[PDB]
Structure formats: structure tokens, C-alpha cells
Design a protein around this ligand. Sequence first.
Ligand SMILES: OC[C@H]1O[C@@H](O)[C@H](O)[C@@H](O)[C@@H]1O
Ligand SMILES: OC[C@H]1O[C@H](O)[C@H](O)[C@@H](O)[C@@H]1O
Ligand SMILES: NS(=O)(=O)c1ccccc1
Ligand SMILES: NS(=O)(=O)c1ccccc1
Ligand SMILES: [Zn+2]
Length: 257
Amino acid sequence: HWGYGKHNGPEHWHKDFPIAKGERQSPVDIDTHTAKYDPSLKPLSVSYDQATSLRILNNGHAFNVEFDDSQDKAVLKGGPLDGTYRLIQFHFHWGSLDGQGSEHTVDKKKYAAELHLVHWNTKYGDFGKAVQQPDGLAVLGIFLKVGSAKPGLQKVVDVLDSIKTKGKSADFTNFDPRGLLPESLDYWTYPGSLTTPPLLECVTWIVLKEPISVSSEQVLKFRKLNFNGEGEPEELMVDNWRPAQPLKNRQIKASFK
Ligand SMILES: OC[C@H]1O[C@@H](O)[C@H](O)[C@@H](O)[C@@H]1O
Ligand SMILES: OC[C@H]1O[C@H](O)[C@H](O)[C@@H](O)[C@@H]1O
Ligand SMILES: NS(=O)(=O)c1ccccc1
Ligand SMILES: NS(=O)(=O)c1ccccc1
Ligand SMILES: [Zn+2]
């Protein structure tokens, strides 16, 4: 099954998921000089005040913090988006070392990690129907650099010891995802895909320009997670990122002049 190792990682995925070589795959390198300000973008609205987190799960690839998406609570609107997109989960991708870990790159520079807040377009009723649509999903991507600690991340860090291995989950109620955002909502946007199998080309990507800072100790705890299940040989959950894919017939737009 797919993973991030030498024998099942990104360079193998196309054999089961031929869309891996498709026309709008993610992530991509963001060439900041070629990205163009787009005056047609509307103001972006990240409305997370009523978010209801439920659970945190080690799925063998990353950990997902899951939300109640049975009503409009935490939603993303505006910017490049037509209509309302509901938060379903967030997760991260990270490296074995601070010099790698992000999926998107900025002028080829790799960040230590990248946070993905995943939302589905409510016009399609459910996530499963949304991933049959070209505009089914919106992912808000946020880079992580290592420096000062991110206070709003610490509750996540501290629960990871309870979900060390694949298939473990824990209650994770009353978590406020607003604490994971940077100050500025300046962003780049482009049409792309899921960055893990099934690699579906459903995503409007919104990648914030300003990274968040997390401490070395915080990211080191990400790196203590395991890809394997309980009782199996330990394989540290590190380097769970897909490298940049060809831009092909796309343009990256900037929200800022
Ligand atoms: O034809 C001109 C147009 O070319 C497009 O590729 C750009 O996205 C537009 O911003 C520009 O106005
Ligand atoms: O907010 C997420 C979680 O943070 C801490 O783990 C709290 O102890 C727990 O009650 C809460 O579910
Ligand atoms: N796509 S996958 O599951 O990573 C895969 C790996 C090796 C051979 C065929 C498929
Ligand atoms: N990593 S990603 O593109 O945010 C993603 C989101 C949901 C499912 C699969 C992948
Ligand atoms: Zn992701």
C-alpha cells in the first residue's frame, strides 16, 4: 500500500493512481516573482469561532484532527472561492530535519512542515460527493518554520504520545484551530489536487505567505510518531511529504499587490 518509503513512496504512486501524472497535481513550487496579483479575488474569510473538534487519529500517514462538519460552523469563504467550504479535518506534513518537510515550496525553499486545513464545498452535500467535483475542496496551507513556540499548537503536541501508532485515536474536543493561524492572511492560490493518494484533482489551494513559528521541541514531538501499528517494528513518521509536481497549464495568483 502507498506510503513514503523508498518502495511505496511518491515515485511509485502513479502505478495505482495514474492521476499522479495528471494536469493539475499538487504540491507545486510557488515562484513568487511569476505569481501575479489578482484584483478579482474577494476578501478571504476564515470563520472558525464555532469550530467543534472531535478526535485526533494516527492514520499511518499523518495525524488528523477531525471536526464536526454536520453544520456550518468552521467555514472558509471568499478569496477565490465560490460559496461556502466547511472544515472537516486538519493535518501536517513534516520532515526528519528542520530543512525539509513542507509540500509546497516558495522559490524552491522548503519549510520544516506544512499544515493543511481541509474544507469541502457545501453545495455538494458531503465530502465524498465533493471529491467528484473540480471545485469540491479548498485546502488552506500554512508553512511552519522553527523558532519560537506556537502556543496554540501545544495541545496537539501533548496528545501525540497517546496516538503513537497507526490506528490509534483520542478524544480531542474543544480545540480552537484559530490558534494555528499567522497574523496575515496574504496568500497564493491555484487549482490542484490532494497530495496523497487518491490524488484527486478537486482542490482550490490557498497557501498563506506568512509562516507560523513553532519550537524545535514541538516539531521533534511530531517526529516521535510512528507510521507502523502497535507491536510492529518502529518506523518513525517523518518525511511524509510529496515533492513539488509540474505546474503545467496553471498560474499562481497572489492576494496582495
Ligand atoms: O490575456 C491576458 C491575461 O492573460 C492571463 O494569462 C492572465 O492570467 C491575466 O491576468 C491576463 O489579463
Ligand atoms: O482541546 C484539545 C484537548 O486539549 C487537551 O488535551 C485537553 O486536556 C483536552 O481536554 C482537549 O480535548
Ligand atoms: N501506488 S502504490 O500503492 O504506492 C504502489 C507501489 C508499488 C507498486 C505499485 C503501486
Ligand atoms: N494533503 S491534502 O491534499 O490536504 C489531503 C486532504 C484530504 C485528503 C487527502 C489529502
Ligand atoms: Zn496534506
